[PDB]
Design a protein around this motif. Structure first.
Motif, PDB file in Angstrom:
ATOM      1  N   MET A  44     -51.437   4.745  37.602  1.00 14.11           N
ATOM      2  CA  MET A  44     -52.546   3.882  37.210  1.00 14.11           C
ATOM      3  C   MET A  44     -53.730   4.699  36.708  1.00 14.11           C
ATOM      4  N   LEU A  45     -54.300   4.281  35.581  1.00 13.14           N
ATOM      5  CA  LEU A  45     -55.518   4.875  35.059  1.00 13.14           C
ATOM      6  C   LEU A  45     -56.728   4.118  35.595  1.00 13.14           C
ATOM      7  N   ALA A  46     -57.917   4.564  35.189  1.00 12.11           N
ATOM      8  CA  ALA A  46     -59.128   3.838  35.549  1.00 12.11           C
ATOM      9  C   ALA A  46     -59.226   2.522  34.793  1.00 12.11           C
ATOM     10  N   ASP A  47     -58.729   2.485  33.559  1.00 10.88           N
ATOM     11  CA  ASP A  47     -58.669   1.264  32.771  1.00 10.88           C
ATOM     12  C   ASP A  47     -57.312   0.580  32.848  1.00 10.88           C
ATOM     13  N   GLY A  48     -56.302   1.252  33.394  1.00 12.74           N
ATOM     14  CA  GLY A  48     -54.936   0.790  33.281  1.00 12.74           C
ATOM     15  C   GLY A  48     -54.318   1.241  31.977  1.00 12.74           C
ATOM     16  N   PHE A  49     -53.100   0.767  31.735  1.00 10.78           N
ATOM     17  CA  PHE A  49     -52.399   1.057  30.492  1.00 10.78           C
ATOM     18  C   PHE A  49     -51.836  -0.244  29.946  1.00 10.78           C
ATOM     19  N   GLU A  50     -52.199  -0.575  28.710  1.00 12.52           N
ATOM     20  CA  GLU A  50     -51.806  -1.829  28.081  1.00 12.52           C
ATOM     21  C   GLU A  50     -51.058  -1.517  26.796  1.00 12.52           C
ATOM     22  N   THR A  51     -49.775  -1.855  26.762  1.00  9.62           N
ATOM     23  CA  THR A  51     -49.017  -1.720  25.533  1.00  9.62           C
ATOM     24  C   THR A  51     -49.369  -2.851  24.575  1.00  9.62           C
ATOM     25  N   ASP A  52     -49.054  -2.637  23.302  1.00  7.63           N
ATOM     26  CA  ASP A  52     -49.287  -3.628  22.262  1.00  7.63           C
ATOM     27  C   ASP A  52     -47.998  -3.833  21.486  1.00  7.63           C
ATOM     28  N   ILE A  53     -47.521  -5.069  21.446  1.00  7.13           N
ATOM     29  CA  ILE A  53     -46.318  -5.416  20.701  1.00  7.13           C
ATOM     30  C   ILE A  53     -46.776  -6.116  19.433  1.00  7.13           C
ATOM     31  N   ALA A  54     -46.606  -5.454  18.294  1.00  7.72           N
ATOM     32  CA  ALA A  54     -47.075  -6.006  17.035  1.00  7.72           C
ATOM     33  C   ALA A  54     -46.138  -7.101  16.542  1.00  7.72           C
ATOM     34  N   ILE A  55     -46.715  -8.067  15.838  1.00  2.00           N
ATOM     35  CA  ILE A  55     -45.971  -9.207  15.316  1.00  2.00           C
ATOM     36  C   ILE A  55     -45.771  -8.990  13.822  1.00  2.00           C
ATOM     37  N   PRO A  56     -44.571  -9.209  13.290  1.00  3.91           N
ATOM     38  CA  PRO A  56     -44.386  -9.152  11.836  1.00  3.91           C
ATOM     39  C   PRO A  56     -45.132 -10.276  11.137  1.00  3.91           C
ATOM     40  N   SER A  57     -45.479 -10.030   9.872  1.00  5.12           N
ATOM     41  CA  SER A  57     -46.370 -10.939   9.156  1.00  5.12           C
ATOM     42  C   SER A  57     -45.679 -12.238   8.768  1.00  5.12           C
ATOM     43  N   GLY A  58     -44.376 -12.199   8.503  1.00  2.00           N
ATOM     44  CA  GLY A  58     -43.665 -13.417   8.168  1.00  2.00           C
ATOM     45  C   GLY A  58     -43.499 -14.309   9.377  1.00  2.00           C
ATOM     46  N   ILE A  59     -44.288 -15.382   9.439  1.00  2.00           N
ATOM     47  CA  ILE A  59     -44.329 -16.261  10.602  1.00  2.00           C
ATOM     48  C   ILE A  59     -44.321 -17.699  10.110  1.00  2.00           C
ATOM     49  N   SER A  60     -43.306 -18.459  10.503  1.00  2.00           N
ATOM     50  CA  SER A  60     -43.406 -19.906  10.412  1.00  2.00           C
ATOM     51  C   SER A  60     -44.333 -20.391  11.515  1.00  2.00           C
ATOM     52  N   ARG A  61     -45.354 -21.153  11.131  1.00  2.00           N
ATOM     53  CA  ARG A  61     -46.395 -21.693  12.005  1.00  2.00           C
ATOM     54  C   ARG A  61     -45.896 -22.414  13.270  1.00  2.00           C
ATOM     55  N   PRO A  95     -47.343  -2.980  31.776  1.00  2.00           N
ATOM     56  CA  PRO A  95     -46.136  -2.601  32.514  1.00  2.00           C
ATOM     57  C   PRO A  95     -46.330  -2.752  34.013  1.00  2.00           C
ATOM     58  N   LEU A  96     -45.205  -2.798  34.723  1.00  2.00           N
ATOM     59  CA  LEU A  96     -45.211  -2.971  36.169  1.00  2.00           C
ATOM     60  C   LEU A  96     -45.004  -1.671  36.931  1.00  2.00           C
ATOM     61  N   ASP A  97     -44.172  -0.765  36.412  1.00  2.00           N
ATOM     62  CA  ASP A  97     -43.992   0.529  37.065  1.00  2.00           C
ATOM     63  C   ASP A  97     -45.240   1.384  36.923  1.00  2.00           C
ATOM     64  N   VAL A  98     -45.854   1.363  35.742  1.00  2.00           N
ATOM     65  CA  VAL A  98     -47.216   1.847  35.602  1.00  2.00           C
ATOM     66  C   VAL A  98     -48.131   0.914  36.386  1.00  2.00           C
ATOM     67  N   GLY A  99     -49.187   1.482  36.981  1.00  2.00           N
ATOM     68  CA  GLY A  99     -50.245   0.715  37.613  1.00  2.00           C
ATOM     69  C   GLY A  99     -50.813  -0.330  36.677  1.00  2.00           C
ATOM     70  N   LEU A 100     -50.872  -1.574  37.144  1.00  2.00           N
ATOM     71  CA  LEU A 100     -50.743  -2.704  36.233  1.00  2.00           C
ATOM     72  C   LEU A 100     -52.039  -3.033  35.495  1.00  2.00           C
ATOM     73  N   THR A 101     -53.165  -3.160  36.196  1.00  2.00           N
ATOM     74  CA  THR A 101     -54.418  -3.492  35.525  1.00  2.00           C
ATOM     75  C   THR A 101     -55.568  -2.677  36.099  1.00  2.00           C
ATOM     76  N   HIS A 102     -56.733  -2.861  35.473  1.00  2.00           N
ATOM     77  CA  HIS A 102     -57.991  -2.397  36.044  1.00  2.00           C
ATOM     78  C   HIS A 102     -58.286  -3.108  37.358  1.00  2.00           C
ATOM     79  N   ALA A 103     -57.969  -4.399  37.434  1.00  2.00           N
ATOM     80  CA  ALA A 103     -58.345  -5.213  38.581  1.00  2.00           C
ATOM     81  C   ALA A 103     -57.259  -5.324  39.642  1.00  2.00           C
ATOM     82  N   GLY A 104     -55.996  -5.120  39.284  1.00  2.00           N
ATOM     83  CA  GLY A 104     -54.917  -5.266  40.238  1.00  2.00           C
ATOM     84  C   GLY A 104     -54.312  -6.648  40.327  1.00  2.00           C
TER      85      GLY A 104
END
Lengths: 310, 49, 49, 291
Positions: A1-18, A87-96
């Motif tokens: 766990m970091l002081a801020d935590g670690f947050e991954t980002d999953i990018a979305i492809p641009s072609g999206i049906s609404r 992630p869950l194995d990584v320390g999850l949030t700043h707040a817990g």
């Protein structure tokens, strides 16, 4: 766990049906398997298409080993451009604390650890499809930890029937009757489950165990006197019918029995292999539940506060 | 008088209690749904059979 | 009479749950507990064989 | 600030001897149902753990402490008891003093789990409740000391009392009601292991019957190996049938039940800073949880 935590980002492809964009906003709290702890990935990496193995579509029982090779993570907030998860194995949030929406038939109680199961049950098989990106999303079902150890025990015992040319489908919890959907199991992963059993099965047998086997006539005599001992055998155990026929007796005398404790050594080897095996088949119960405004029951279809379990 | 109603005929056993018919009930032997059913995927047909 | 008018039969055929269970044939608290205090002996004509 | 503090309210009517014992119990481990700001003391007491009818035994206290939530009492006001929970409140502060009820000393860098008071008491007269505080002893001893007391109970149906940690003696015997308080844990051991050692012995009908020390290793190694030859090394393939596959599942759940009980996870690690490394009995020890 970091002081801020670690947050991954999953990018979305641009072609999206609404309509598929609104389908992602219903995935507010789900569980997502990441292969790595890389900071930026794609939805194709998350989805079921990359989640297959090489050329072979995995079954339900074979999907458990695919889970423990990867990293369970929980979606926090759906953005228009990307999906932010922790992630869950990584320390999850700043707040817990994380919110988790129940895609589960069974309500939750406080303090109980959560393990997670593939989509197994009948009727409630729900997989989100992203038809603009031609993607399929199979999301796991969070469940209480003694329930997950039942379901793994029901699936693994089903595959052992397939190696031998009735019945085992029905579970019970909180009085609910529920069965599970399964048709076939690949002969590959069953051997991987079974070899993980019998090695841990053998490694509990030590010299003190045969001394414990002499107490089999004591329990079947003691189940006459107390109903609490009658709560063991349940008529479906081997040991009730095993005590009716075999009268074992102790070996004597043990080599170097002065210096050593055979009953003590059999227990500690038992606690590290057989009592460990609830962790070895499924994945670990990383998460339990701690409601803050005290709700004893978290209902099916609602969020819940979430705190790690050691 | 008016439009002539059509009676139905359903085979039933002889030895049922007449007391089941002195209150409002079903011609079916079991109470149907789906008001009686709860919150589960199976309950509506599970009440039936 | 039930909640709504219904003639609900309660038989003693219905009483399997409290009787057929083996908890009736238990002694242990009675003989082991009544003999805490000493009691004098009456005529041992029926008691002895 | 942003530190979380549970506030336990004491019902009024305390006699002057009763508040003195509560004044003394400063650093101890106390469980509670749910993390919440304000809370009565009735959920703290040992009477709140009952199922009947029945005061709970050593097996139930191990089961309760998973569902209960551990907290360490801070300073004790005469108004309220302020305690912080371990699992959420400590992740911001970082340091909490903790006094041993254990007679075993503590070295630096040790992991500490919690054990119910089976090793071997506060009761309040005016408030009509009891208090039982668990024992914060180290986690490698925790798998030992529990397993020593189980080994005594099997002898009820050499010395087990010898436990020498960091240069100190221990006497497990010290008696009467400790044995019967632990009786329910003993029976679930033997029923788990003997049901284990029949099903493995039924699926492999010749584990014991196999030849000693050299064929058994050759039977071990092929089973120990990683290669694809797995199932043909295992299975042996009107009249009644042994319900083996159902007896698999009932044993795995009972074994899976005891995994959560006897893990005794390292909730607390102690980092001694500006002081002696050895922390002895009746001494406040600083506590740092996992970051």
């Amino acid at each position: 766990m970091l002081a801020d935590g670690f947050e991954t980002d999953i990018a979305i492809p641009s072609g999206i049906s609404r309509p598929d964009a609104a389908a992602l906003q219903r995935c507010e709290g789900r569980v997502v398997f990441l292969p790595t702890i890389r900071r930026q990935l794609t939805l194709a990496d998350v989805a079921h298409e990359s989640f297959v193995s090489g050329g072979v579509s995995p079954d339900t029982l074979g999907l458990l080993l695919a889970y423990r090779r990867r990293f369970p993570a929980v979606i926090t907030r759906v953005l228009p451009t990307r999906i932010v998860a922790c992630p869950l194995d990584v320390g999850l949030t700043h707040a817990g604390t994380v919110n988790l929406r129940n895609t589960s038939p069974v309500d939750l109680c406080n303090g109980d650890p959560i393990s997670l199961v593939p989509p197994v049950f009948e009727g409630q098989a729900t997989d989100v499809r992203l038809d603009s990106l031609d993607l399929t999303l199979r999301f796991p079902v969070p469940l209480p930890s003694p329930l997950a150890r039942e379901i793994v025990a029901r699936l693994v015992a089903r595959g052992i029937r397939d190696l031998n040319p009735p019945d085992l489908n029905v579970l019970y919890y909180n009085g609910s009757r529920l069965s599970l959907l399964a048709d076939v199991q690949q002969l590959g992963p069953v051997n991987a489950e079974l070899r993980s059993l019998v090695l841990n099965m053998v490694y509990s047998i030590t010299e003190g165990t045969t001394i414990i086997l002499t107490l089999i006539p004591r329990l079947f005599a003691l189940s006459a006197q107390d109903g609490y001992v009658n709560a063991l055998l349940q008529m479906q155990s081997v040991t009730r019918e095993a005590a009716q026929l075999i009268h074992p007796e102790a070996p004597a005398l043990m080599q170097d029995g002065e210096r050593r404790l055979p009953l003590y050594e059999a227990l500690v080897a038992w606690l590290t292999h057989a009592g460990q095996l609830g962790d070895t088949l499924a994945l670990a119960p990383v998460v339990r539940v701690c409601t803050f405004d005290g709700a004893a029951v978290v209902r099916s279809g609602d969020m819940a506060p979430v705190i790690r379990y050691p | 008088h008016g439009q002539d109603a059509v009676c139905e005929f359903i085979a039933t056993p002889v030895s049922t209690d007449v007391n089941y018919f002195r209150r409002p009930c079903n011609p079916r032997g079991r109470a149907a749904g789906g008001v009686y059913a709860g919150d589960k995927e199976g309950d509506v047909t599970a009440l039936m059979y | 009479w039930g909640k709504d008018r219904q003639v609900l039969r309660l038989s003693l055929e219905h009483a399997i749950g409290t009787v057929c269970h083996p908890s009736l044939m238990n002694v242990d608290a009675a003989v082991g507990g009544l003999n805490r205090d000493p009691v004098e002996a009456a005529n041992p004509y029926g008691a002895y064989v």
